[PDB]
């Protein structure tokens, strides 16, 4: 295990794509700069998330570094959306490549982070009892980082999709259930279908999920890209989401029956989550949401033979694309198998775990394996700041931030991909936000300043700016966002230009002093 410094210009706090982006720029920036990292290795969730069937919802073309040429030109993506093998191995060459790990402190997880007031730096212990003394913070811990009764006495096999095991788990005839049908549990299911006698999939709220038609990428395509990544890179930076995609014009209301059966039938059959954006007013309007829901749940209807447990799996009463938009391959179609049984937990709450498996208030499920598909790493931080106060305190409402970058009372502290969340390509919102974190801490040494804080009026001017461009969209309808709503709506494009222009002027809305 290498030991963490005693002092450093930099502490970063995670080793995924963002702490990984930040130890680097920091290096190159000629600034001293440690990483801490509760995994044994790089990856984030690509190093956590090693069930069956994980894959990212974003092509593999745009879910990728930019800030290497070398790394463009050399690494060759297979699919169009990259499998968590593949994406860890894709970071796995990047710290190879750039020698990023001499830089990591790994198996260790930092509990407590105090800010001296009196020498400008913070003081950062570890669950190991390390204490480091860094100038600043970057919290690149991310924001994907269960309470059931009598779980501990189940007698069988416990697996839990974020903390998957690092061998390969044959769960060739056994009954397995899976609890959850988020992400993790739509894309791991059909995988332990193919194995299981039974499969016992545990849903309560159904998910909107569309196909990914996901395919082998096409190397002339891939070699005609490499050769104009970077201006292709840049048009992602000019988009809304920060990926490509049309941005259909209509409004869903104002065509006829026939028209939005024939635009949608052709993403649904294109895949992917560019449907979000087939009519300009899908996340804005509710009619014109509905329309749009009522065709997918129609197809949900039409995939599933059974009418009783296709309808048990069509999501109603919240409006669609409001949360994540999930791809799904071959889950519908998993629910015509013999050996596959939806279990309505709606209907029939879970009571407790039993040692032979789970009870529902009508039956109880015999298992030999339980599959638990799962601000919250920065919460269960000890971060205290100006007058000694908790950010989980100051953050109990949500998270209250200045660009969602930094927040008032905590000088010197940055948060990556943490609050306002700004694009559904993470891999461009995360380049931003490290660049613009890094380059300010640059700054700060080239004029010798050592304290940066956000201004509180801004930071409110801020929330409330954040709150008004929701309430132009569907998104505050459900509370998966929630008092302090904590995602900024506006687009990728529009949120670097904003953070461009505070730079630009003298980082306005920070007080920078020695
Ligand atoms: C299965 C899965 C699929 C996803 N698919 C997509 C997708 O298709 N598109 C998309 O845009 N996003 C996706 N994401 C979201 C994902 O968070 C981002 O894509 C991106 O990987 C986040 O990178 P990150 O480095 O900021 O955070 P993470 O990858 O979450 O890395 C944070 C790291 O910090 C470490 N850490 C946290 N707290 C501490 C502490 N106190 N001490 C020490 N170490 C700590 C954690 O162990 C972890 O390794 C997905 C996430 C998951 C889990
Ligand atoms: N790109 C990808 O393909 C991918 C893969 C994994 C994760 N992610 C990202 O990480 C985030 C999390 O996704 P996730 O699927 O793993 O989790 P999730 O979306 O939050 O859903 C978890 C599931 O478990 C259920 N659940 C939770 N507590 C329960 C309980 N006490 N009893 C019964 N059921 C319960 C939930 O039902 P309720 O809805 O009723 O609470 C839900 O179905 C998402 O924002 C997603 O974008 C992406």
Redesign the pocket.
Known sequence: RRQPPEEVDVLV????????YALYRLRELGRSVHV????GD????????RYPG?????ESIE?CYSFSEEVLQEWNWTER?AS?PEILRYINFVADKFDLRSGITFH????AAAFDEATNTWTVD??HGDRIRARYLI???????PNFPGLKDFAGNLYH??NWPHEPVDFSGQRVGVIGTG??GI?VSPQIAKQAAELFVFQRTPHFAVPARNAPLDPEFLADLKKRYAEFREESRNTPGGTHRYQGPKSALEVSDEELVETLERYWQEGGPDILAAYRDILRDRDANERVAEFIRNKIRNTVRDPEVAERLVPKGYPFGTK?LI?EIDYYEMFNRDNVHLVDTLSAPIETITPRGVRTSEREYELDSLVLATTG??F??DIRGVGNVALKEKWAAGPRTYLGLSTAGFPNLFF??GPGSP?????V??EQHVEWVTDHIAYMFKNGLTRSEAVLEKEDEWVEHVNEIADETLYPMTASWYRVFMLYVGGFHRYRQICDEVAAKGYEGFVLTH
Request: aromatic share 10%; hydrophobic share 45%; proline share 0%.
């Open positions: 706090v995670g080793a995924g794509f963002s702490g990984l801490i990292e509760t995994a790089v990856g984030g969730v690509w190093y956590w998330n994980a894959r990212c919802d974003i879910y959306y968590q260790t997880t930092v509990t570890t669950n919290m690149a811990s991310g924001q994907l980082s999709t974020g992400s993790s894309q994540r791809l790493a920065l269960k931080i990556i991909a694009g559904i390509n993470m891999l919102s995360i």
